[PDB]
Amino acid sequence: MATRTQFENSNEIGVFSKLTNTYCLVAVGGSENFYSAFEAELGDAIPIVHTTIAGTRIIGRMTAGNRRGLLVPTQTTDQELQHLRNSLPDSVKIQRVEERLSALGNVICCNDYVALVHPDIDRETEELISDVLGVEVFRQTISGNILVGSYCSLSNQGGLVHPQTSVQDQEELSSLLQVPLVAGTVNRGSSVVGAGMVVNDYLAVTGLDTTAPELSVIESIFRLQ
């Protein structure tokens, strides 16, 4: 399932697209080949929608969510929200979140059952995430970095944590999420795995620069095969 792709000769796959177990989102860039790359590995099994946040191509890092629902920042226009709702099945919830910051994707790292957010995030934001997404919220940081969303990546089969994450932190995260976790790099030594790649319970997408050892590590940690 592991596939190598690049959006307009760009290695940051996790920035131009957002993918989950129930839906996939990609930018509206002129190069449609990026959409075909996801279609080949997914087809019509799950909806693939062209969308943007405030017209930006960084929708991947501008939004966070899980299978239950998707969240968008305040910068998202009402037109974009209605387009997403029309193009997204009603089974998946949509809820706008208001905060001083805008980078929800970098601020919230979450999977289908647990969520990790900025310790100083909005008080009501944690409740909104717990309700809409139906996942636990933990005010914690990994690898001593505030931007857990981009640095780390989480799923149900596994999670590729920051390569610099300590052994004790990895063990604690695995015991909390009840899933295996291993520290490693992607995109030819890129420490920000979340921005460089996206992963779900049945598919993994990485940049073309991703070396074979990185692909093998991603396959092993997520137990694709």
Binding site: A54, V107, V192
Partner: protein
């Protein structure tokens, strides 16, 4: 790269918007662009840290401007500006050296620099 209102003068000092340990950047180069040269939001510029740890002093390194503070016409019509000039330091390949970026980050700059957007916590 759509045109934006310039105005940053050569030699301008801007606040460092990353936790890499630096606090200001001395812009001395407008590399990446073709008369009085000037920088703009999202432009990669080589600069030297004036105030900060001695390690980063006296050595030129690439930097990306995240705030301009000068009124510019966004392609969506709405006029907007920042409170003060700010920038971030990164390698020529766009890999952010600073672990995290602080303060507002230009939407136009973040869009053209996916790596900066990933390390940018406050878009717009």
């Amino acid at each position: 790269k759509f045109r934006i209102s310039l105005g940053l003068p050569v030699g301008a000092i801007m606040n460092c918007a990353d936790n890499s340990g630096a606090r200001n950047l001395y812009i001395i180069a407008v590399k990446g662009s073709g008369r009085l040269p000037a920088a703009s939001l999202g432009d990669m510029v080589m600069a030297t840290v004036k105030k900060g740890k001695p390690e980063l002093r006296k050595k030129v390194m690439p930097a990306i401007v995240v705030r301009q503070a000068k009124s510019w016409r966004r392609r969506d019509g709405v006029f907007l500006y920042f409170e003060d000039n700010a920038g971030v330091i990164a390698n020529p390949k766009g890999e952010m050296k600073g672990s995290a970026i602080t303060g507002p980050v230009g939407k136009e700059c973040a869009d053209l620099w996916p790596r900066v957007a990933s390390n940018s916590g406050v878009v717009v």
